[PDB]
Design a binder for this molecule. Structure first.
Ligand SMILES: Cc1ncc(C[n+]2csc(CCOP(=O)(O)OP(=O)(O)O)c2C)c(N)n1
Ligand SMILES: Cc1ncc(C[n+]2csc(CCOP(=O)(O)OP(=O)(O)O)c2C)c(N)n1
Ligand SMILES: [Ca+2]
Ligand SMILES: [Ca+2]
Lengths: 675, 675
C-alpha cells in the first residue's frame, strides 16, 4: 500500500542519512516510523507556515532519533530537503545531530538532553489551554490544537519527566498525547538491567489515560485509533504505549548495537530489498509517497485558510480581543506597556528586590496579558503572584481556571524550567516566568541551558540570592550560581540593586525575544540609590557615582552596590576618592558599544569588583576582585556579612590595598585585550 | 506514659529551639515526633561512636525539619546539648538551619535541598548490601543494618527522588525503610493545588512495599509494627505512609503557616499545658525521658560490644578478609596500591582519556576492593566497567549479585550523584564513581554541590568533555560546565592531557577523603606528552616545557596541552619562544605552596591560557585567555576545532598578539594580588 511504502521510505531515509554521516542513531527511527507516519497524518500543520498558531505541535523528546524527524519534514515539504539529509551531522548543515529549533524548520524545541522534550510538550499544552481559555468564544474555536510527543525509555528514567508528568496529570491536560517507544533497549542493553518499574501503573498514578498498542511495528490502524481514543479523553493527558522493536527490519534489530551507530552496508541492502526498494539507491523518495503526503498538506492548508477567515470574523465579533490577539501574533507588546513599570527616587524607603519584583509584576500583569508564570512551591517567599489573579488550574478542581495566569508548579524546579521553554515555544508572544530560590535554579540547569541554546525569552525570578538570606545556611546560599549562568552563552543574569534597577531588569526580561533572563533578587531590604534610573540600568552597566579624579572605581551588583557607596564614604576619610559602577547585567553591558563600555570602565584607574559570591568572570570588568569563594553559614545575615568582611570598612580596606598595589604601575581598562 | 512524655519533650524542644532563633520550621517536627521516637527506639546506634559500621542509619530528607533531628540527638546524648539547641540557626553553632554532616554529630549527610536525603538513603542501603555481600560469612553477620529515611511531600515532588526510588525498587533494597510525612501541606498551601498524584500507587509501580499508618499523630504502636513488617520484606524497600497533622498540637496545626515560621508565644504556652509541661519553662528535659533513652543507649552499646567481639572472631576465622575489613575501617587504602596505576612514555600511542580511564579502572579495581561505581546508561561510551567484574544486582534477577562492583544507574544522573554521596556516607573507605557525559553532570548539580559541602570523596567519570565529541553537537558539548564546578568550593576538576596525567587524576580521586572529583575526559585520542609524569601532574599544575628565555607561557588543560605544544613549534618559526604549563587540576594547584606556584607561573612573562570552553576562572592563571564562550556545532570534531581556530596556527596568532600587547609593559604573575 502507499502507507506501507511511506513507512519504508521514512525508515530508509533515516538509515541512509545515518549512513552518509557515518554517525547517528538508526534504531529508534526504524522502530518509530509507523507511529510517525500515523501521527503526522492526524496532525494539522502547514510546511509553508511553521508558525500557524493553531497547528498541532510535535515534539521528539528522544532527540537522538532526529533522522526520523528530519525525514518527516523533508517528505512533507518543509524548508528541508533530501540534500540537507545527505548533510546530516555535517558542520553547518540544517540537519544537526540533535534537533535545534533555531536551525531546523519544524523543530518546535531543542531536544537531545533526555527528558526535556516531554516537559516542553507539557508546556506547549499548558500554553494552548491558557490561550484557548483566553481567546475562544462560542462559534470561535481560535485554539483547539493538540501536542504530540514521542519519548523513549531514557526520557522516562530522567526525573524531570516524572515531575512534568505528575504536574500534567494534575492539570488535566487532555490535549497532550505522548507516545512511549517501548522497545526495552537502552545504551547499556536490556531495560531489565536498570528500568523494571511498571511505567503504565506509574502513569495511571499521575492521572494519565493509557492506550496500549501491542504491535506498533506494523499496526498503524491501532496507532490512529489510539489518537482518536486520546482525543475523547478531554480531562487527562494520554500515554500511548508503542511496543516496538528497536531497529525494526535490521539484522541487528532488538539489540543495543542498533541504537547509536550506523548499520552495516549489507544490512542496509537487505532492508531495501525486503521492502521493495533498490539496494543500489540511497535517499529514494517514491513519487506516490510525495503525492499522498502532498494531499494531506493541501487539506491542512485549506484548514488554515478557513482558520484565517475565522480569525477575521473573530476580529469583527470581538474587536478588543481580536486586536489583542493580532498584536500578540505579530510579536509586539502593548504600546507603551513600560509606562506601568514602577519608578523610585532616593527619598523612597528601602525595599528587598524580591518585594520590588512583586510590585513590578502587580503593575505589569494587568497591562500585558501574555505574561503568565508561577513558582516551584515558593509563592509567599518569591512573591511571584499578583494579588487578585487566579491560578491556572482545571476548573473541575475549583482551585482556578485555564484562563488563570499563575501556575503552582510544586517542588519541581527542573520541570518548571522545561515547561517554561514549552510555553515560550508555543508562541503568541508569551512572556513567562518561574520563581524559586536562586540556589535551586541549579536543579534546573539542564533546562536553563536549553533556554539559552533555544533562544527562548523565559524568566527565572530567583530570590534569596546570597548569604543575605541568613539562617537557612550554606545549603541555600548561592556561591557558584551566577558564575555558572553568566558563563553560559546567551543568558541575561540581572542582579538589580534597587527599585529602578529592578524595573530595568523586568523591562529587559519582558522585551526579550531571544534571550532567557535570570533575576537574582534579595531577601533583605536595600536602599534606593542616588543616581539610579531605568534609563541607565537598561544599559546593563553604568556609572552610578562619577568621580573625575578617582583613585579607584568600585564595580558592584545587587546588594553590594549600596555597600560600595558606603565604602566610598569611608575611603573619603582615608583620603581616597572612589567612583562606583553598578553592573546589573553583564550580558546587556557586554552588548553596548565599546565607547560606552569604556566610559564606564575607563583606562588609567584601578577597578575593584564587589559581589558576595564567586569571583569568576569578574576579571572581565575589574583588576582586583572581592568576592566569596567558600560556602556560607547559618546565622543572622548581618552577622554573616560581618564575618566575611563585606562591610564598608572591609571594602575600603581592600580598595586602599588595591590603590597601593597599582602605585607606580600603568593601568588600562579590564575591557582591553590582546585579541 | 514515659513514651508520651518523650514525644512531648521532642516536640517542645523543637518548638523552643525555633522560638529562641526566631527562625525555622516547627510544623514537620511537631508532626513527626511520634515517628521519630518510634524509629529511634528501633534503631541500633552508639551516641559515643557515631562511626560504628553496623549502626542503623537515619536520614532526615526533609532537612528543614532539623529541629526534630537535633532534639533526638540531644536526648540520646550525642555530642550535642540543650545549650547547642538554644543556639539553633545562630552563627557558628552546632545546630545550623539545615543539617550538615561536617558539623553535626549524628547527621549522616547534608540535607535541606529537597529530594537529596532519600537518594542518599538509597546509596547508604546500596553500600550496606554490597558491604554485607563482601564480608558476611556463616555465623558472622558483620553487616546487617537498616537505613531509615524521613521525607515529605517536597521530596516526593522532586524528580531526583523518583529516579532513586525507581532504581531502589529495581535493586530490591530490603533494608531501606522510608517514611512519608503525609500531611497534605507545603509552602504554597494544600497539596491539592499541585500534588494530587497517587503516591502509594506510584511506589507500588517501582516495586516498593507499602505500610500505611492512618493515625501517625499518636499511633506509635502502629509505627513500630510497620517497621517490623518492613523488616520481613527482605526483597523490597518499604514506604511507610505516616498520615500526620503538620504542626500537631498548635493552634495553627494543619496550615501552611506552621510549616516555616516560629509559633506565637501564646500557642507555645497552650502546647505546654496540654501536654503537662510548665508554660513558663523552655528546653525542658524530664529526667524520666533521659532515663528511658539512656536504657536504649546502654542496650545498643552492649550490642556494639558484642559486634566488636564478633569482628575479632571474624579476623581469626577469615584472616584475609578480616585484615581487609580492618584496613578499610581505619580509613587506609592498600599499601602501595598506586603501583598499579599505569605509566606511559612519549613513545606510546595516542589514546583518548576516556580509554586511559578504562585502563586505570581495569588495573586498580582488582587491587582496591572499596572501589565500586557505575554509569548512567553510558557504560560503553564512558568505558567505566572493568572487564570480568559483575554488576551489582539482586541475585534473584540473574543479572548480577550484591557482591558485584558495577552499578547500572540507568538514565538517572541526578540520583546517581546523590546515591554516590550516600555510598560515601556509609563509610568503610568506599571510593565510588559515576560515569556520564560531562555536559550531563549538570543534570546532577544539586547533588554535586552537596558532595562538595559534605566533603565526600566521590568521583564523576565525565567523558566527551568538549567540542571534541563532534557530531552530537551543541546540546552535548560543554561550554560552561568546568567553570561552574571550578567556581564551587571544594571540587577537584581534573582535565588530564595524557596517560600519566590520567593516572595522577585517579591517584587524587581515590586518595581523597574530603574532596569530590570530576574527571573531564575526551572522546578523541591525545598524544602522550614529552615531560608528563604522575609525580608532576600530582601537583595539579606543572611546567611541561620549560623555556628560560620565554617570550610567553601557554597554560592549557586536557586536549589543549598537545595543541599548545604544537603551537610552540609554529611560534619558534615566528621567532617567539614559548613555555608550556599543564594545569590538570586548578584546585590541587591552588593548594600548592606559593613558591611552587610561582615557579610554574612566574613574574615577568605574559601568560596565555588555552582551553576549548569558557574563559571564566582563567584570569587566576593567565593574562590573556583563548577559550570558547559560545555554543558548539554538529560536525566532525577536527572541523569544529578548525572553525573556532583551535589550531596550532590559531593559538600561535593569539600568542604573538599577546607578546605584542605587553611590549613596553611590566608584567607580574597572575598569581599576584592586592589582598
Ligand atoms: C540527559 C541525558 N543523559 C544522557 C544522554 C546520553 N544518551 C543519549 S541516547 C541515550 C540512551 C537512550 O535510551 P532510549 O531513550 O531507550 O533510546 P533508544 O535506545 O530506544 O534509541 C543516552 C543515555 C542524553 N542524551 N541526555
Ligand atoms: C530543592 C529545593 N527546592 C525548594 C526548597 C525550598 N523549600 C524548603 S521547605 C519547602 C516546602 C517543603 O514542603 P514539604 O516537604 O511538604 O514540608 P512540610 O510542609 O510538610 O514541612 C520548600 C519548597 C528546598 N529546600 N529545596
Ligand atoms: Ca529504549
Ligand atoms: Ca508536607
Amino acid at each position: 500500500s502507499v502507507d506501507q511504502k511511506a513507512i519504508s521510505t521514512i525508515r530508509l531515509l533515516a538509515v541512509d542519512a545515518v549512513a552518509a554521516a557515518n554517525s547517528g542513531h538508526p534504531g529508534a527511527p526504524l522502530g518509530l516510523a509507523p507511529a510517525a507516519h500515523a501521527v503526522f497524518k492526524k496532525m494539522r500543520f502547514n510546511p509553508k507556515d511553521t508558525k500557524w498558531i493553531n497547528r498541532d505541535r510535535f515534539v521528539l523528546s528522544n532527540g537522538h532519533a532526529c533522522a526520523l524527524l528530519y525525514s518527516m519534514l523533508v517528505l512533507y515539504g518543509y524548508d528541508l530537503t533530501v540534500e540537507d539529509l545527505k548533510k546530516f551531522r555535517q558542520l553547518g548543515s540544517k540537519t544537526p545531530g540533535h534537533p535545534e529549533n533555531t536551525d531546523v524548520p519544524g523543530a518546535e524545541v531543542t531536544t537531545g538532553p533526555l527528558g526535556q522534550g516531554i516537559c516542553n510538550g507539557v508546556g506547549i499544552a499548558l500554553a494552548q489551554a491558557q490561550f484557548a481559555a483566553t481567546y475562544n468564544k462560542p462559534d470561535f474555536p481560535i485554539s483547539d490544537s493538540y501536542t504530540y510527543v514521542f519519548l523513549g525509555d531514557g526520557c522516562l528514567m530522567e526525573g524531570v519527566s516524572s515531575e512534568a508528568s505528575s504536574l500534567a496529570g494534575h492539570l488535566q491536560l487532555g490535549n497532550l498525547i505522548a507516545f512511549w517507544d517501548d522497545n526495552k533497549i537502552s545504551i547499556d542493553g536490556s531495560t531489565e538491567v536498570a528500568f523494571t518499574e511498571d511505567v503504565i501503573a506509574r502513569y495511571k498514578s499521575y492521572g494519565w489515560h493509557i492506550v496500549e498498542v501491542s504491535d506498533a511495528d506494523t499496526d498503524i490502524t491501532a496507532i490512529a485509533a489510539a489518537i482518536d481514543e486520546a482525543k475523547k479523553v478531554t480531562n487527562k493527558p494520554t500515554l500511548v504505549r508503542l511496543t516496538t522493536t528497536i531497529g525494526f527490519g535490521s539484522l541487528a534489530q532488538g539489540t543495543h548495537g542498533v541504537h547509536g551507530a550506523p548499520l552495516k552496508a549489507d544490512d542496509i541492502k537487505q532492508l531495501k530489498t525486503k521492502w521493495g526498494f533498490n539496494p543500489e539507491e540511497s535517499f529514494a523518495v517514491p513519487a506516490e509517497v510525495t503525492a499522498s503526503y502532498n494531499e494531506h498538506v493541501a487539506e491542512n492548508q485549506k484548514i488554515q485558510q478557513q482558520w484565517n477567515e475565522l480569525f477575521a470574523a473573530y476580529k469583527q465579533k470581538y474587536p478588543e480581543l481580536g486586536a489583542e490577539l493580532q498584536r500578540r501574533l505579530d510579536g509586539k507588546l502593548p504600546e507603551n506597556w513600560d509606562k506601568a513599570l514602577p519608578v523610585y527616587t532616593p527619598a523612597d524607603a528601602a525595599v528587598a528586590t524580591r518585594k520590588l519584583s512583586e510590585i513590578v509584576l502587580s503593575k505589569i500583569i494587568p497591562e500585558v496579558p501574555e505574561i503568565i508564570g508561577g513558582s516551584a512551591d515558593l509563592t509567599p517567599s518569591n512573591l511571584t503572584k499578583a494579588k487578585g489573579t487566579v491560578d491556572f488550574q482545571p476548573a473541575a478542581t475549583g482551585l482556578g481556571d485555564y484562563s488563570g495566569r499563575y501556575i503552582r508548579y510544586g517542588v519541581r524546579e527542573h520541570a518548571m524550567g522545561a515547561i517554561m521553554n514549552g510555553i515560550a515555544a508555543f508562541g503568541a508572544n508569551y512572556k513567562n516566568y518561574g520563581g524559586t530560590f536562586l540556589n535551586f535554579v541549579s536543579y534546573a540547569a539542564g533546562a536553563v541551558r536549553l533556554s539559552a541554546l533555544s533562544e527562548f525569552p523565559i524568566t527565572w525570578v530567583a530570590t534569596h540570592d546570597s548569604i543575605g538570606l541568613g539562617e537557612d545556611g550554606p545549603t541555600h546560599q548561592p556561591i557558584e550560581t551566577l558564575a555558572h549562568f553568566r558563563a553560559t552563552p546567551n543568558i541575561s543574569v540581572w542582579r538589580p540593586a534597587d527599585g529602578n534597577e529592578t524595573s530595568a531588569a523586568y523591562k529587559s526580561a519582558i522585551e526579550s525575544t531571544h534571550t532567557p533572563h535570570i533575576l537574582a533578587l534579595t531577601r533583605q531590604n536595600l536602599p534606593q540609590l542616588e543616581g539610579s534610573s531605568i534609563e541607565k540600568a537598561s544599559k546593563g552597566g553604568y556609572t552610578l557615582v562619577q568621580q573625575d579624579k578617582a583613585d579607584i572605581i568600585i564595580v558592584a551588583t545587587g546588594s553590594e552596590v549600596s555597600l560600595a557607596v558606603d565604602a566610598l564614604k569611608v575611603l573619603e576619610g582615608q583620603g581616597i576618592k572612589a567612583g562606583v559602577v553598578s553592573l546589573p547585567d553583564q550580558l546587556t553591558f557586554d552588548k553596548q558599544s565599546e565607547e560606552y563600555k569604556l566610559s564606564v570602565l575607563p583606562d588609567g584607574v584601578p577597578i575593584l569588583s564587589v559581589e558576595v559570591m564567586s569571583t569568576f568572570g569578574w576579571s572581565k570588568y575589574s583588576h582586583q576582585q572581592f568576592g566569596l569563594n567558600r560556602f556560607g553559614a547559618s546565622g543572622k545575615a548581618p552577622e554573616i556579612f560581618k564575618l566575611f568582611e563585606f562591610t564598608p570598612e572591609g571594602v575600603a580596606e581592600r580598595a586602599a590595598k588595591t590603590v597601593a598595589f597599582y602605585k607606580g604601575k600603568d593601568v588600562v581598562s579590564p575591557l582591553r585585550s590582546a585579541f
